Amino acid sequence: KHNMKAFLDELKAENIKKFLYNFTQIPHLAGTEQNFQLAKQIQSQWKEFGLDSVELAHYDVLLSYPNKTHPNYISIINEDGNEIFNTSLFEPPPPGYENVSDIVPPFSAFSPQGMPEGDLVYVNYARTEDFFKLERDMKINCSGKIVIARYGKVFRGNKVKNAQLAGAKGVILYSDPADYFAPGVKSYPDGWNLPGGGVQRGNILNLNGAGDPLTPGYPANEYAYRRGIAEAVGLPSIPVHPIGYYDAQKLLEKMGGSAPPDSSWRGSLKVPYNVGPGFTGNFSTQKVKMHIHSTNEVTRIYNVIGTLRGAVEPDRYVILGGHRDSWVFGGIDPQSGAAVVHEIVRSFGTLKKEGWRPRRTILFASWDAEEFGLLGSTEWAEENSRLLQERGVAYINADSSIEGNYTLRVDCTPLMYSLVHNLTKELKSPDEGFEGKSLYESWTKKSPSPEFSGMPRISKLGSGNDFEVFFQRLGIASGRARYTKNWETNKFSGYPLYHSVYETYELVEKFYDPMFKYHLTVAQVRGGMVFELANSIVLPFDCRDYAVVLRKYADKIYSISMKHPQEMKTYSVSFDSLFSAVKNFTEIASKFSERLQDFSNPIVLRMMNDQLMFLERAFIDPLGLPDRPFYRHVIYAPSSHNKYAGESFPGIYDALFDIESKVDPSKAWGEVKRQIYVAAFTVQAAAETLSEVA
Amino acid sequence: KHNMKAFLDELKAENIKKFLYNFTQIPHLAGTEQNFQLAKQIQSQWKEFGLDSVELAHYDVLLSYPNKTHPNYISIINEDGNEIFNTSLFEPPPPGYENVSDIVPPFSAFSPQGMPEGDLVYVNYARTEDFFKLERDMKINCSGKIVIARYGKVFRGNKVKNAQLAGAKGVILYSDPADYFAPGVKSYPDGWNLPGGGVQRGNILNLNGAGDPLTPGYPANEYAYRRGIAEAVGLPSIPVHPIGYYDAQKLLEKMGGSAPPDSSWRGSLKVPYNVGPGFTGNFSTQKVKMHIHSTNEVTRIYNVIGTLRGAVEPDRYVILGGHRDSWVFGGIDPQSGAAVVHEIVRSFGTLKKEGWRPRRTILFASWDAEEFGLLGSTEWAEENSRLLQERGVAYINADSSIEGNYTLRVDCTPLMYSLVHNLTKELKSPDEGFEGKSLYESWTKKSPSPEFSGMPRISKLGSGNDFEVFFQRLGIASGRARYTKNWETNKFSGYPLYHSVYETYELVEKFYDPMFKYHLTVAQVRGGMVFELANSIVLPFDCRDYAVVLRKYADKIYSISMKHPQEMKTYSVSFDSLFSAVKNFTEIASKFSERLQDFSNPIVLRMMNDQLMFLERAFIDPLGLPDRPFYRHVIYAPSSHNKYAGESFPGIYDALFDIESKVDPSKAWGEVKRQIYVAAFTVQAAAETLSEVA
């Protein structure tokens, strides 16, 4: 029999281990020859595994690289202009890789060039609230200063945007041991912690969903018209560079000016964490000087796109996609995900070779240039947007499979909650102490829902991964899953070795998942979701789950506004239309669910499957959110303060944010009311897609 | 048998005559009680005729009305401020209507209030090229002048926009006998010509597809947030008023300054048609003074929406819609169309009562507030956009059925050309001299295609009617048909009595269509198109016809650019990508047509019907055209110079228009190249929707 169990049983931990090893022996930086060779390898193997077609889709997009003969570094310079301390030119390579070529040195991708010299101000995590504290409470002015900020809490491009708007003339990013060194564990190679010489690479763009900076809205194909650099989307205006904590300690130790406002501003280094500006008395004539010489360059990138044609509904697409490009070896990010996708393709191909095909078409994607701004997935979606919006059932992301070894992490649309609950009840838990129990049981025990008894936590989608175009721009139901750490007992950010030269195959095999049992569990979750989406007769979406969350988010946004009762009275700000729309959605979703259960008629079925598929699509507003035309989903958008976090009712949330500081309250509360109207109308319009069609 | 012939045979000229009489005894101005009563009458009758549901959909939109106790008029004032001549306060009512109440006096809807006094400049038809001639060739400056312009050639809102940008402080519109008095025919009531006291009402907005000025993008429902008047879309900034040719002759006869530049500037009045500014020597101290006191007011409007549910594909909608509101009696516009829709609803309802249902759902619409800017249709489409874009098969408009008695006029998407040709070959011609011949035969003989032998002319859709939202914003295949005049042997504009108090039931019954045989023919064309769209197993669209026209339009836009060969060399402006995309579309459309002919499988069928339905949709760009976000179709938009005319490849056309006058040619030709890229990409993307789906 060819059923889900046959698919799941064919998946093997040992294959995922072999593929991970194969994908992480050399760097696969986007735009380099090594990453093109790996694309061609994956294309050939997916064909051998049995897919119907496998093509490369290429684009020419703006990338950024250091200059090999003019390296980036930061100095402390004395009054005579002598550089008395320089930061490192590269990370010390890990054992057995000290002769590997083409390791890109640490840099912030898309930084402009410059050699700014000035006094330092320490800005904590450079979040919106850190800058409010400096400017409004401490009266510290960053204008014309170099800011130094610790990584953590928010996407690094938001930190750079915040520093730019504060008037900074450069930004230094660093990894503090408070956020990247777990107590009691050793530094790589003897444990999974970040050494003092490790550095986190990463792009610092603020693209808001645009894709390639030069071609917003349209694929970067051979005849594309490109914006000039000065009109490009999302590029920073001040130089930026990242460093490790040995180098940060030398820049921070001399800091003077004001004390940190409180303990939340202190990391773990043996320094005062003074905010500045500048250095204490003895050193007050010393300054900090950046030297950034990286260049932006249009460069060819390659996505691999595999098709397994559907037997019954070939014009319905279920997409499993994840990136292939890495900053260095990508032992976790992305190759622990790419190895899982490769084994999933192999397992589906084994069924196909025995004569099976799924009901709907499955598309498999190996995206390029994700690390430079989600460029490969977004360009491909721009090229194929008409196919995707009329035919796209769901997108399942497949970046890193593990970021810890504690429990499952799922982030997805409410439409997939029931699918995930039911699938995880049928899968075995890999956790010690839960032998013979379901994954649902271990996950629910370790990560309880804040809202419901005997349910697990499932988070909102934010951004910072390749589902962004599919979900926030095109309104295709999307989800992701991986193994993660215990977020309670840990104060560190993500995993410590993120985007460092130390993130290797050995890291994973020695410290995260020696038996590859967590990778296998994640392959079962991602592949099982794909299987059910592509094979279930009725699409496995439950509209009633969206009704429940919409009420939660309406309660939340109303609570924010109700901190301003006098203004709500003055400007007649009512949420009644939004609660009415959510009540209607709840009633109509309940009636649709009864029909779906009570309806031999393939046209009633497809009609009803189209109602299910287009429900996520109904939350799209073609005019987009304010000043973010490519964030079109009215219920969810990446937070304006942190691309990695999702925000609910984002148009209303941003209209309310810091509203007490706005100079024209009547204008500000009028925009709150406009966003309430847009949200209530969109929820009611989405509800009406589930009414009887005529 | 219940087939198309049964439907067509049930239609009766005598019923259309009775309905026309019933709809034209009193005015039905939008927003008035009489128009609401007629909406309720139509709702009740459509229910009696047999529709499954019939509802009113209401909205509160900005309308405009004169002030009943402070009338609008224009004066000539002498140096002492005495008003020595006043224009009329109303049109002399026609025989037997001299006691009818609630006839709105002539006014330009949405004019601001004002009493500007100044010197006149005559600007011919106030087209873009008329203002170029005045400013660039004659060196006449309109700044601070009142302009007087003759109706004709272009939409009156474009004339007002052009006068505003020339610096005018007011506009007087008038009907010249050259354009509204056919030689050899008598004035109403003794013939169909415009009397000297007749005046053309009409709105002067420049909405570019937005709908209600106060709520662009969103329906004007009970909780809508409205823009303030100062931020409203499309309102004119200078006062405007229309007059008849007896009053125009008094304003024009004293004109001095420069002579008309040539004969194309002279109408038929016994005046010199001097351009001004101001009056000849003896009268040079006299001025013209407008007095406009109309007010804009949010007012409730009502669409009637009837549903005949489909038997097999109830979630596929074929829409037959036309407006109900009129300026006065609406004897032609719109009631000659509304009477045809009413008889079509009656005939479908007769089949339904005998047990028949069409394959797909048919929606019937009686739109409100069309005369004030397409407001009813656009608000309803904004409310229902998600249903329409996923389910809308086609929209057939049904405004005026007749504007002459000579031959058929059809304007539609290329997707419907084959449908129209085949249907008209099966219909009887009503024309004298073609007894026993098909409508196709008389139409082709009287209105030959410029391109093809033995084919009839079918024009592009422009705007200025209720299909605009469906076609240009949402990308739903649309078409319209009516009986029209001989455009060769006539120098007049549209029909002479347009938007005057004289456009009555008697006009139609005495002079246009005494036997109602042209109305019956138009009912057969519109109802037959609806029938075939709602009942054919395979949707009756031929993608190959789009391929043919795309080549014609690419040749045309290339020819425009090739007037500037030096700039095309300097800036490397190539149309190669656009011709490549059109070649690919032609090849892929041919292969799709073979599959459609070569494919018992209802899923292959619907898959292929969805490919046909979403083909028009594929030409939509979600980012819209430059500065016109609600014109989203890349192949067709209303002309930027004349809303009534369609323009092909509008983004490229507007980038090329008057390009030799642009101050920065590199920037201007860069925008030409960007628009070529957008057009080539959209054509290729639309082609790829017709490729095999996996």
Ligand SMILES: *[C@@H]1O[C@H](CO)[C@@H](O[C@@H]2O[C@H](CO)[C@@H](O[C@@H]3O[C@H](CO)[C@@H](O)[C@H](O[C@H]4O[C@H](CO)[C@@H](O)[C@H](O)[C@@H]4O)[C@@H]3O)[C@H](O)[C@H]2NC(C)=O)[C@H](O)[C@H]1NC(C)=O
């Ligand atoms: C949730 O679903 C319900 C339907 O179950 C839907 O109810 C609709 O609410 C609107 C109000 O937003 C109602 O609109 C009224 O319609 C009647 C005619 O049917 C009008 O006469 C009303 O206008 C009068 O009253 C107003 C309020 O005092 C005045 O402002 C106005 O000037 C008029 O005097 C009003 O337009 C509508 O009837 C119901 N439809 C029903 C019950 O079927 C509700 O809107 C949905 N929620 C959302 C957010 O869409």
Ligand SMILES: *[C@@H]1O[C@H](CO)[C@@H](O[C@@H]2O[C@H](CO)[C@@H](O[C@@H]3O[C@H](CO)[C@@H](O)[C@H](O[C@H]4O[C@H](CO)[C@@H](O)[C@H](O)[C@@H]4O)[C@@H]3O)[C@H](O)[C@H]2NC(C)=O)[C@H](O)[C@H]1NC(C)=O
């Ligand atoms: C019409 O349909 C055809 C397919 O039948 C489609 O053809 C495609 O054209 C593009 C060009 O726009 C081709 O792209 C090439 O792809 C190859 C790899 O397959 C690349 O190596 C090429 O790049 C090299 O050459 C360029 C030109 O000199 C250089 O600028 C570049 O730096 C590289 O040196 C280039 O990208 C593509 O292969 C074909 N696909 C086929 C034939 O299947 C055509 O684009 C369609 N028209 C439109 C408007 O879409």
Ligand SMILES: CN(Cc1cnc2nc(N)nc(N)c2n1)c1ccc(C(=O)N[C@H](CCP(=O)(O)C[C@@H](CCC(=O)O)C(=O)O)C(=O)O)cc1
């Ligand atoms: C800050 N929060 C929440 C958080 C983090 N750490 C914590 N610790 C404790 N102890 N406790 C906590 N409550 C906590 N909370 C985040 C941050 C990041 C992630 C995330 O998962 N990120 C990656 C990133 C994958 P990438 O590297 O390939 C994408 C790339 C480009 C992105 C782009 O350009 O758009 C980039 O980010 O540089 C992914 O999505 O897989 C999700 C949540």
Ligand SMILES: CN(Cc1cnc2nc(N)nc(N)c2n1)c1ccc(C(=O)N[C@H](CCP(=O)(O)C[C@@H](CCC(=O)O)C(=O)O)C(=O)O)cc1
């Ligand atoms: C100027 N060209 C071409 C033309 C006209 N007359 C000619 N004579 C000779 N002899 N020769 C010629 N070549 C010629 N050519 C036009 C102008 C108008 C039409 C048109 O058909 N118009 C109505 C208008 C219906 P409406 O009144 O209900 C819409 C309303 C609101 C519109 C809005 O706000 O968007 C308004 O226009 O005021 C319709 O579409 O049914 C189509 C072509």
Ligand SMILES: *[C@@H]1O[C@H](CO)[C@@H](O[C@@H]2O[C@H](CO)[C@@H](O)[C@H](O)[C@H]2NC(C)=O)[C@H](O)[C@H]1NC(C)=O
């Ligand atoms: C990763 O695995 C691939 C696939 O097995 C290896 O590529 C093959 O290498 C052999 C020996 O060089 C060739 O004969 C095959 O043509 C290759 N197959 C391909 C490219 O599909 C590759 O060597 C492995 N890489 C590493 C680093 O182990």
Ligand SMILES: *[C@@H]1O[C@H](CO)[C@@H](O[C@@H]2O[C@H](CO)[C@@H](O)[C@H](O)[C@H]2NC(C)=O)[C@H](O)[C@H]1NC(C)=O
């Ligand atoms: C998750 O599993 C539940 C429990 O089996 C499914 O809910 C049942 O669905 C069947 C089949 O339609 C109904 O007859 C039952 O009454 C449902 N039981 C309930 C609601 O407890 C549910 O549909 C599954 N969710 C999916 C497939 O998305």
Ligand SMILES: *[C@@H]1O[C@H](CO)[C@@H](O[C@@H]2O[C@H](CO)[C@@H](O)[C@H](O)[C@H]2NC(C)=O)[C@H](O)[C@H]1NC(C)=O
């Ligand atoms: C237009 O026709 C309608 C429908 O026949 C007429 O309205 C009917 O009038 C009679 C007599 O007043 C009433 O008893 C019916 O209730 C009406 N039916 C409706 C409204 O559906 C109407 O009188 C006619 N109008 C004109 C001007 O002839």
Ligand SMILES: *[C@@H]1O[C@H](CO)[C@@H](O[C@@H]2O[C@H](CO)[C@@H](O)[C@H](O)[C@H]2NC(C)=O)[C@H](O)[C@H]1NC(C)=O
């Ligand atoms: C218009 O009528 C023509 C002539 O009947 C139709 O074209 C024929 O379609 C049949 C049925 O598929 C084919 O077998 C013939 O070979 C076609 N003949 C041709 C192209 O001359 C055409 O499809 C009709 N158009 C519609 C319904 O939109």
Ligand SMILES: *[C@@H]1O[C@H](CO)[C@@H](O)[C@H](O)[C@H]1NC(C)=O
């Ligand atoms: C890199 O630096 C070298 C050495 O100074 C220089 O010659 C070259 O221009 C730079 N390359 C760039 C800017 O791409």
Ligand SMILES: *[C@@H]1O[C@H](CO)[C@@H](O)[C@H](O)[C@H]1NC(C)=O
């Ligand atoms: C830092 O590098 C600069 C540039 O090469 C050099 O002049 C300086 O001597 C270095 N300083 C130290 C302390 O190594």
Ligand SMILES: *[C@@H]1O[C@H](CO)[C@@H](O)[C@H](O)[C@H]1NC(C)=O
């Ligand atoms: C910050 O510093 C600069 C002085 O160089 C000044 O332009 C800016 O207005 C200051 N902002 C304050 C004090 O808020």
Ligand SMILES: *[C@@H]1O[C@H](CO)[C@@H](O)[C@H](O)[C@H]1NC(C)=O
């Ligand atoms: C794996 O789990 C063990 C046991 O809880 C823990 O002590 C160890 O730190 C974990 N490894 C990683 C990399 O999280």
Ligand SMILES: *[C@@H]1O[C@H](CO)[C@@H](O)[C@H](O)[C@H]1NC(C)=O
């Ligand atoms: C109409 O004019 C009258 C008479 O002067 C005036 O009282 C009233 O304000 C006007 N109505 C309006 C502006 O709606």
Ligand SMILES: *[C@@H]1O[C@H](CO)[C@@H](O)[C@H](O)[C@H]1NC(C)=O
């Ligand atoms: C024009 O109307 C104004 C306003 O009522 C009046 O003062 C004037 O006498 C009228 N002029 C003529 C010539 O009728």
Ligand SMILES: *[C@@H]1O[C@H](CO)[C@@H](O)[C@H](O)[C@H]1NC(C)=O
């Ligand atoms: C038109 O007239 C006004 C003078 O009042 C002036 O402001 C404007 O620049 C003139 N334009 C010309 C002469 O082009």
Ligand SMILES: *[C@@H]1O[C@H](CO)[C@@H](O)[C@H](O)[C@H]1NC(C)=O
């Ligand atoms: C109707 O047709 C006749 C015969 O061609 C023509 O002379 C007459 O003017 C037409 N009526 C109208 C209103 O066009």
